[PDB]
Amino acid sequence: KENLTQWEYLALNSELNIADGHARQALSPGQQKIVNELPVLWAESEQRPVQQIESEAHQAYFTLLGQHGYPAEPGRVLSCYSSSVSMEILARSLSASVDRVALVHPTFDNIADLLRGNGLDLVPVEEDALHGADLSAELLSSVGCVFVTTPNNPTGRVLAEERLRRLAEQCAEHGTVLALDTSFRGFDAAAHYDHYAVLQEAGCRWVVIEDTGKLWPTLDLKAGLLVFSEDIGLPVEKIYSDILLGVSPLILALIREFSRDAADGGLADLHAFILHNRSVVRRALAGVEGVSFPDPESRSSVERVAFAGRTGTEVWEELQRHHVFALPCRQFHWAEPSDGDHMVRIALSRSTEPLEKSVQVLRTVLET
Amino acid sequence: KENLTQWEYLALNSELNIADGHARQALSPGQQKIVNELPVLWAESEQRPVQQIESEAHQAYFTLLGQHGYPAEPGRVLSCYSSSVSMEILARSLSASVDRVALVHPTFDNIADLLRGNGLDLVPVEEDALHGADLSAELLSSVGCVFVTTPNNPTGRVLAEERLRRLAEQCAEHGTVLALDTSFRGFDAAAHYDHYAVLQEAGCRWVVIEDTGKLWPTLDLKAGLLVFSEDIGLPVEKIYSDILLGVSPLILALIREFSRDAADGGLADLHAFILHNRSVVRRALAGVEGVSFPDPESRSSVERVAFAGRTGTEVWEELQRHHVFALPCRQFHWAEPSDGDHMVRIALSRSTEPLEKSVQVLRTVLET
Numbered sequence: 184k185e186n187l188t189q190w191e192y193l194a195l196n197s198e199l200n201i202a203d204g205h206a207r208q209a210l211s212p213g214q215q216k217i218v219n220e221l222p223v224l225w226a227e228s229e230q231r232p233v234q235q236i237e238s239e240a241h242q243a244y245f246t247l248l249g250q251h252g253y254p255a256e257p258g259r260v261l262s263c264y265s266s267s268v269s270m271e272i273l274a275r276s277l278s279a280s281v282d283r284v285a286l287v288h289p290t291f292d293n294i295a296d297l298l299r300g301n302g303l304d305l306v307p308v309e310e311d312a313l314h315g316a317d318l319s320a321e322l323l324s325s326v327g328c329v330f331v332t333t334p335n336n337p338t339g340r341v342l343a344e345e346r347l348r349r350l351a352e353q354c355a356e357h358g359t360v361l362a363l364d365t366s367f368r369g370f371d372a373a374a375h376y377d378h379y380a381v382l383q384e385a386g387c388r389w390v391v392i393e394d395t396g397k398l399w400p401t402l403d404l405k406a407g408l409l410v411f412s413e414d415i416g417l418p419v420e421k422i423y424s425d426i427l428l429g430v431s432p433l434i435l436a437l438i439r440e441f442s443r444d445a446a447d448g449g450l451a452d453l454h455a456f457i458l459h460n461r462s463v464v465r466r467a468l469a470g471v472e473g474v475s476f477p478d479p480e481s482r483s484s485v486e487r488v489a490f491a492g493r494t495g496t497e498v499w500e501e502l503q504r505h506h507v508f509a510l511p512c513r514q515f516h517w518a519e520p521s522d523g524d525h526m527v528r529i530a531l532s533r534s535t536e537p538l539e540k541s542v543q544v545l546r547t548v549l550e551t
Numbered sequence: 552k553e554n555l556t557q558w559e560y561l562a563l564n565s566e567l568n569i570a571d572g573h574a575r576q577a578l579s580p581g582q583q584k585i586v587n588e589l590p591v592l593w594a595e596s597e598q599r600p601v602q603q604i605e606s607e608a609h610q611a612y613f614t615l616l617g618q619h620g621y622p623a624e625p626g627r628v629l630s631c632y633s634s635s636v637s638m639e640i641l642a643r644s645l646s647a648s649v650d651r652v653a654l655v656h657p658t659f660d661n662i663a664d665l666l667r668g669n670g671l672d673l674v675p676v677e678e679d680a681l682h683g684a685d686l687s688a689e690l691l692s693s694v695g696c697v698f699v700t701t702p703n704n705p706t707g708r709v710l711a712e713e714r715l716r717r718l719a720e721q722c723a724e725h726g727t728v729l730a731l732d733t734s735f736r737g738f739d740a741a742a743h744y745d746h747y748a749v750l751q752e753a754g755c756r757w758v759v760i761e762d763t764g765k766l767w768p769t770l771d772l773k774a775g776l777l778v779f780s781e782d783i784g785l786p787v788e789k790i791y792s793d794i795l796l797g798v799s800p801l802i803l804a805l806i807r808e809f810s811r812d813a814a815d816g817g818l819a820d821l822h823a824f825i826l827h828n829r830s831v832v833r834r835a836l837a838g839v840e841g842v843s844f845p846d847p848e849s850r851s852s853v854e855r856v857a858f859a860g861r862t863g864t865e866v867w868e869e870l871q872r873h874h875v876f877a878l879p880c881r882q883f884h885w886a887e888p889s890d891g892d893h894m895v896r897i898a899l900s901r902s903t904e905p906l907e908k909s910v911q912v913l914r915t916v917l918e919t
């Protein structure tokens with residue numbers, strides 16, 4: 184009710200959960216071999232310095248996704264329990280010296296709520312403005328930080344390299360912090376150009392929150408990776424250290440192993456699997472008059488579906504009576520929820536059969 | 552440097568780390584059997600509703616430690632990545648409506664730093680005042696929350712049932728939130744009377760932060776458990792849900808299994824192990840001139856050593872020269888750091904060989 188996560192609680196124990204964006208599909212054979220070796224990874228984690236495991240996990244993950252220029256010095260990458268924990272750290276860090284943040288709209292709502300809960304005033308930037316033109320000098324001088332989710336959740340829209348470059352330059356020209364949430368990076372190769380090369384070359388203050396969680400079905404074993412420019416000028420390291428000593432070496436080793444499996448062909452398979460599931464959904468809502476797909480080009484692991492004549496809340500209630508749990512979209516539009524009134528979001532990181540069943544139910548529903 | 556956690560980073564990749572209080576001893580045979588069956592726990596975590604696993608982990612852990620009255624209704628116990636995340640949620644939840652918190656002094660320093668970081672003013676309450684007498688009406692009426700760590704870290708002092716009852720009654724009559732951090736509960740049977748029974752009977756608004764992390768050597772796989780009265784009147788549920796959907800079911804299953812091993816005899820083995828390691832430290836230093844132990848009755852996994860004639864931080868430097876990492880105590884006295892510059896803290900949740908190595912260095916240093 185109060186936010187998207189509270190809608191997601193309702194799905195957590197149902198077999199037709201198509202709500203939260205976490206990866207819940209079956210493990211691949213290669214991934215299952217990693218799970219089978221957990222006691223070997225446990226022993227390794229008992230015996231090696233955590234710094235070496237962590238360094239190996241960062242190198243595997245960043246290189247996997249083309250981020251070759253990431254700062255590999257310890258500790259320029261802070262490994263957090265989750266990217267939301269990274270976001271809480273950044274948010275509270277920003278509130279030490281910033282009053283206002285320009286934020287892409289729509290986006291996942293806990294980004295807005297963590298920023299707002301830490302006392303920051305939010306200025307929405309619609310995706311068209313963000314991708315299509317320079318930000319206004321008026322905007323950039325009224326905010327201390329521009330925050331971009333890319334690929335965006337829920338739209339899948341990717342900030343292209345030329346636009347990231349121009350944005351980083353505008354932020355440098357105004358001294359404003361450029362912050363990126365790249366949680367969905369792994370799903371779309373358009374997001375695999377080297378973002379850190381661009382940022383370092385522009386010379387702006389910057390933070391990037393990476394996330395290993397949404398990509399592989401690891402039972403929510405994950406890290407958020409909070410990466411910050413040398414001159415970030417915010418107390419991210421101090422506040423990080425108030426919250427944690429570090430993450431489990433076993434999780435870091437799991438990230439290392441899953442990244443290597445991904446580099447050896449798992450990532451291509453993941454892209455094919457997500458594309459298959461997206462087609463399942465779009466074929467199932469084939470003709471269905473009134474139905475449309477707002478993000479024709481998205482390659483993300485979540486999928487928006489729009490409809491005329493119904494609200495997403497009504498669709499959600501009709502769906503739930505059949506034990507199918509999706510997500511109304513109102514709350515992604517954190518500055519104007521009515522923008523989301525006629526959409527639901529569907530999770531594609533699911534085994535195809537339960538997904539198929541859920542969308543067949545949505546098809547029936549979406550025909551009164 | 553800036554807090555105790557930053558002192559703890561220095562030891563993290565070192566063979567003679569006796570600094571942080573995390574459990575780093577070897578798995579028992581029963582515990583290693585659990586680790587060997589991780590692939591089975593993984594399969595269980597994929598197949599069963601997380602809610603069932605979580606309820607089972609909570610029941611196992613609360614009943615293990617005497618807390619039979621805990622609220623077992625789903626949603627009343629909020630499983631967090633760590634008790635520090637629980638603490639961040641609580642601190643932010645307090646910041647809207649509370650200006651000042653009465654906080655036991657000394658205590659672990661990120662408790663103070665997370666409260667201060669979220670805008671709360673702190674009022675120290677020395678242990679002897681806290682345990683030995685009712686709090687003044689003047690203090691209680693000037694403060695929105697009383698926060699007590701029991702068993703305390705670093706002293707191991709346990710809030711007795713009679714005092715908890717009176718303290719909860721006093722907070723109820725002044726409209727004050729009583730908050731307990733009970734992360735060290737499992738080490739001291741003196742803390743295994745049912746805290747939830749007395750909290751509910753007194754009828755104050757309350758929060759308890761439980762923690763599984765310090766008890767067992769699980770490579771930091773753990774949960775903080777944030778528990779709250781129905782009338783708590785703070786946004787703990789909302790801010791929780793801003794931060795996370797939930798913890799890994801695999802970690803929940805692990806907690807359940809380690810709690811069951813502990814109920815089968817592992818807890819007694821742990822108490823005997825910790826007592827052994829404390830005995831090692833105290834026998835090693837019994838005769839050194841100027842050396843004392845301020846907490847003779849502590850059963851905690853951390854041990855305070857006091858010494859005349861040198862600063863806890865000079866002793867820290869000498870031990871470092873010999874590749875031994877403990878902690879200076881100044882920063883536990885978060886309101887008056889000089890109260891602790893003649894003590895260090897030693898970590899006991901360690902294998903006995905490296906602990907014995909570490910304490911032999913300390914004897915030698917304190918003799919020269």
Ligand SMILES: Cc1ncc(COP(=O)(O)O)c(/C=N/[C@@H](CCCNC(=N)N)C(=O)O)c1O
Nearest residue numbers: 188203204265266267291293336366793794796
């Ligand atoms: C763009 C973006 N950046 C960070 C995160 C945090 O990921 P985390 O959960 O910390 O691992 C998300 C997660 N979105 C999930 C729901 C997460 C569960 N709810 C909360 N975390 N409050 C979804 O879209 O369903 C994200 O989309």
Ligand SMILES: Cc1ncc(COP(=O)(O)O)c(/C=N/[C@@H](CCCNC(=N)N)C(=O)O)c1O
Nearest residue numbers: 424425426427428556571572633634635659704
């Ligand atoms: C009484 C009490 N309550 C909560 C926590 C948080 O436990 P967590 O680390 O979240 O699992 C602690 C931590 N005790 C350890 C580790 C400090 C690590 N540094 C940070 N956490 N910032 C110690 O005393 O060395 C505690 O003593």
